[PDB]
Amino acid sequence: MAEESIKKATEQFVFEPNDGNTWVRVRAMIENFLILQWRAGALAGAKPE
Amino acid sequence: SYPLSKFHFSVEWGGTKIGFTEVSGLDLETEIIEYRHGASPEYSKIKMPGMQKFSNITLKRGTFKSDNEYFQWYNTINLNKVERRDLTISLLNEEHEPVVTWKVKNAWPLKVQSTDLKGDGNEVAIESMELAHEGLVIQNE
Amino acid sequence: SYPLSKFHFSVEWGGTKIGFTEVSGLDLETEIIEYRHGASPEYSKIKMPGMQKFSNITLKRGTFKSDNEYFQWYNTINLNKVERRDLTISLLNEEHEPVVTWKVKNAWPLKVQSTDLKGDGNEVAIESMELAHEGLVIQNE
Amino acid sequence: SYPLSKFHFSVEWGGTKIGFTEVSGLDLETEIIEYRHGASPEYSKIKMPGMQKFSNITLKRGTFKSDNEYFQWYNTINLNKVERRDLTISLLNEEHEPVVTWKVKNAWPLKVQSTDLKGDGNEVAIESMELAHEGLVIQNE
Amino acid sequence: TYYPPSSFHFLVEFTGIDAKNNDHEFQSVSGLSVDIDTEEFAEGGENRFKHKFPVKTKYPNLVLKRGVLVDSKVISWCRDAIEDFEFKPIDLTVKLLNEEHQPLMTWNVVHAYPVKWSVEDFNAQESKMAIESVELSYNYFKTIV
Amino acid sequence: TYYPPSSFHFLVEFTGIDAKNNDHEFQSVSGLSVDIDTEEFAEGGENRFKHKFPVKTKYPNLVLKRGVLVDSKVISWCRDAIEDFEFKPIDLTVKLLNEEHQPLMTWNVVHAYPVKWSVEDFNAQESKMAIESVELSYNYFKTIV
Amino acid sequence: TYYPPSSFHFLVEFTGIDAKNNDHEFQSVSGLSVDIDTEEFAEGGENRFKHKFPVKTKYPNLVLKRGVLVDSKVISWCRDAIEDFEFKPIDLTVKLLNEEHQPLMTWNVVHAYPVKWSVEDFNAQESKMAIESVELSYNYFKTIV
Amino acid sequence: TYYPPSSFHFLVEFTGIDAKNNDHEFQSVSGLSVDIDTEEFAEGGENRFKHKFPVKTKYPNLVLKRGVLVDSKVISWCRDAIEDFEFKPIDLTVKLLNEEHQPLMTWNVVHAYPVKWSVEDFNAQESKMAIESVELSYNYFKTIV
Amino acid sequence: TYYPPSSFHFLVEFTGIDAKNNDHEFQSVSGLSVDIDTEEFAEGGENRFKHKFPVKTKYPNLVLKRGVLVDSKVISWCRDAIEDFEFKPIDLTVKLLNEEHQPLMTWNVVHAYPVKWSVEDFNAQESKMAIESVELSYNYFKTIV
Amino acid sequence: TYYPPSSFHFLVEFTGIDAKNNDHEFQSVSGLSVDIDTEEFAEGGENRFKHKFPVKTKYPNLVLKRGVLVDSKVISWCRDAIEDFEFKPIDLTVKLLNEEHQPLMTWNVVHAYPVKWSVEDFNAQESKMAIESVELSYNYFKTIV
């Protein structure tokens, strides 16, 4: 489940330039997906780190 | 192949004479609006035209017996009313015909200045006037 | 072994003539940002570059019969629109070829100034223009 | 038993030539902090030293064919980065050796000014530069 | 840093709204800060100070300004919320840039939506540009650096 | 835009009031903006932020200024409401114009009526124009562009 | 108008008080304006705006200033009200004049009486005129033009 | 008047306190004014205005300033009230003078007593005169002219 | 007086604290003033004024400023109160001096103790002296002259 | 002193946070002051003054400013508290320095933790440095000198 959702979220960056201004946007998006899963109780750990 | 000189000219202002000693202030001016958005690669601004301005016009002449034309025009001011006139200024050729013409819309007098008197003042008494207006067009064909 | 003189030059501005009496304002300027933290052993500030500026350019020429190029360019202003031009200024050698070139981006006229008239004005009537622009590059190879 | 003259000197600034027409601005300045307590018998203040300042340095030279050293240094500015240099200014003796030296830390160019052009300008075209810096030491042994 | 960076070179990007280059350029950005609400208590016998306790983390609205743009996608999004109560929150990135135009530091703004839209007054006697202003509410932000 | 438009060229038109050219010319226009009222809530266990919810869309009054005109139709309409409580709401259009004097963008102001009318103080020692000011209440606006 | 009138030429006249030429001349006049008090209501299901309703028409006090005059009839009238609670309301006319010294427009002020009277502070180190100020309450006004 | 009088030539005199020439000279006088408190009422069916009614006449305190005088009789009187609650009200006359040094107009201040006394701050780094200030409460005043 | 004294030459002395010459020198002194609290009453039938009655005499805190002194006795006294709630009130004398450095006039400040102590902000980019400020509460004062 | 010290040379040090030279340098420091809360009481028969009593000692927050630093240890510490409610108080020393760069005087700040963090607004049309600001709450301070 988690892999399919992330895969779809990253389709919007497929034809973007491959540089720092894209790498940072991809990271922010993935982290937002995962923080929600953590709050929901799927992921283990006291804090996101 | 030669430029024009600056001493042969005439002024039509609705008075009885067209000869003047000095004419100045025939200028045009536009304001500038500047802009820069934070993401621009250049660290300077882009410029475009704003609103427009005009300068006041100054006319100088010698004082003559029984000629009170400047005062009489000034004295037409009555609260917010004044006689407005079309002012035509022209640079002349050797046949005394126009070459370069400055056309001025809606002029009226802002101030009238008299001469100063001196015991040893061995010179001509010169009076002057300053005019407000609403626009200038330059013709040179 | 000798320096260049300052009287042989030409200006390309999109008009019909390239001869001018005077050209001025070809400057470049940068702002300075200053800083000092309280624990520093020195009692003065450290400096670094800020944003950039350019000066306006002034051009002067003699008035000629049937030449109204300055007015016509000025008169292309329509609210926020204006005809913008590439301005090229060049210092010439004895073969009348460029030596030093100043390249100016996006110029338009800010103001047009006419001459003053005098009864005893034994001189040439000189008109002038002031231009806004967005950048200057200097070439000397 | 005689003082030094002011016309024989050289400047080392990282460029290809050390000859200049004019050098100015080698100043040092300190601020003053004032104080008076109400019970004092004197009706004036006591003074002590504050923070320190330095002036900008101006350099002037004639324009030469294929020498674009001033522009090239200025053009190293990139947002907050610039090439900084050690500037050494020296007053010379009859053997062309240093007598008085001014040592300047971290200089960079603030502005570059080009010449003005004139139809009757029978003179040398002179360019100039203004430099920011972080400190001056004077040596005279 | 040894020489700290200036503040005049930055980029605003939106996620969930069709991109156009004219919607990434702004005159000014403000509101990237935070605070903690506290409560006080006096303990009998302790006369040197009162105790203070944290309660909540608080963030201000994000404010963006620019010259008026007539075909903006961001404004169409604002209108759907303003006129019909259709709300669909977005994420946003604020980037502070270096001389190679790459980020020095960024801010990740989470779950934002429009609360305000305005245009400054017209004046027949002044030479000025028409300026537009948009304000957004959001839940929190994180930083990457 | 690439070069954003200025704000000094515009037109105000009224629907439901007899037209005169002297009632379409104004010195200044203000009040074309909007905001959303919200409420806050603290959820137990969530210590990172408070929740915020929208409640209502809010608009300010529209304000018009000009030099005093003695035979105005708009003022006759204002007087009927002010003096006799006869209210008959109108619609209005605000137009921002281009160099061909055609609209860049317009605002559609719906169901407006007068709430205020005033003239600035007289002063025997100052050279000034007499200025008139009118304020209108309305329900909402839409834009066309 | 095409050229709107200026505000520095005007006349104040009183009805019910013996006339003197020195009581018709003033330095400044203010307070000729009006407003409408309103109330708000939220209708369930309508989320685009709140409703607004008029309640009352409101007028500010009329304020007159001039240099101090010692034998004024207007001040004697003010004193009877101030010192003895003898109140006898008057009517008043404010006239804005043209170049022939005839009215452009007038204001009819109905049923006025005094609520305030003062003279500005004295200062041994300044060169100034002594200035007097009078404020009147009234019910409403009408205009003629 | 035709040419109104200036305000820089005046005299303050006290009744009930031993006279000294140095207690009649002041830098500034203020507080010679009055106002009327009112109440409002809305009458059902009358929608053009609210009614207003007078209730009370009100006066501000009288304020006097001068350079510091060490042997003042007025200050000894102020101290008895300030330090011991011994109150003994006085009357006072304020005179505005003409070029022959005779009164143009006077104010009769009735039943006054001290409520405040102060001296301005000292500053070792400024060249200034020490200034004293006295404030009095009174019941009413009358004018003679 | 004929020529009133200036305010830049004065002395502050403390009783109950070990003396040092560096604790008698100050940049500025303020707070030497007093006021009387009053109450109002309306008597039925009396419409010319309300009655006013005194209740209490009131004094402000005394404020002293100077450049920072590190070994001050006054500050050690302030710290005992601030840190441990050990309070031991002192008396104080403020002297305004003449050209022979003798008192023109003095103020006797009775039963004072510390309520505040602060030092102004540091700034790496400004050339300024560090300034210290002390505020004292007291019961009353008397004057001698 | 005879010549008091200036305020532009100082050092901020932290205990409990890994040290870096770039976290000890600040543009400005403020908040090193204190006050005492009091209560008032009126005693019947005593009409010269009211009594005042101390209740509590009070301190303001400590505020630090500097240019933006991206790898700061202090900011990482602030983030743990801001984002996760993990609080771990620290001690701090403020040092005012002499010409040998040794302390003239120091302040011992006890048990501090972060309550605020912000960065000033960006502006595309101005040449400015990005400035960061941090505010800390603490219990009390002591001085050493």
Residue numbers in the entry:
A (entry chain e): 595 to 643
B (entry chain k), C (entry chain l), D (entry chain m): 2 to 142
E (entry chain Y), F (entry chain d), G (entry chain c), H (entry chain b), I (entry chain a), J (entry chain Z): 3 to 147
What does the paper say about this structure?
All components of the tube initiator complex possess the conserved β-barrel folds seen in Alg1, whereas Alg7 has one additional C-terminal LysM domain extending out and interacting with the peripheral wedges. The central spike is surrounded by a hexagonal iris-like ring of Alg11-Alg12 heterodimers, forming the baseplate ‘wedges’ with the conserved core bundle and trifurcation units. Six copies of the gp25-like protein (Alg9) attach above Alg11-Alg12, where the C termini from two neighbouring protomers were observed to be slightly different. Like gp25 in the T4 phage, Alg9 mimics the ‘handshake’ to initiate sheath assembly and it interacts extensively with other baseplate components, implying a role in the initiation of contraction. Similar to Pvc12 and Afp12, Alg12 contains gp6-like and gp7-like parts. Domains I–III constitute the gp6-like part and participate in the assembly of the wedges, leaving the gp7-like part (domains IV–VII) exposed on the lateral surface of the baseplate. AlgoCIS exhibits a remarkable structural feature on the baseplate—the formation of an extensive ‘cage’ around the central spike. The Alg11 domain I forms the conserved core bundle together with the domains I and IV in Alg12. Interestingly, there is one additional large domain (IV, residues 278–643) protruding from the distal tip of domain III. The domains IV from the six protomers form a hexagonal cage that surrounds the spike (spike cage).
CISs are macromolecular injection devices with an overall structure that is homologous to the contractile tails of bacteriophages. Their conserved modules include an inner tube, a contractile sheath and a baseplate complex. For firing of the extended apparatus, the baseplate undergoes a conformational change and triggers sheath contraction, which in turn causes the inner tube to be expelled and injected into a target. Here we performed structural and mechanistic studies on a clade Ib CIS gene cluster in the marine bacterium Algoriphagus machipongonensis PR1.
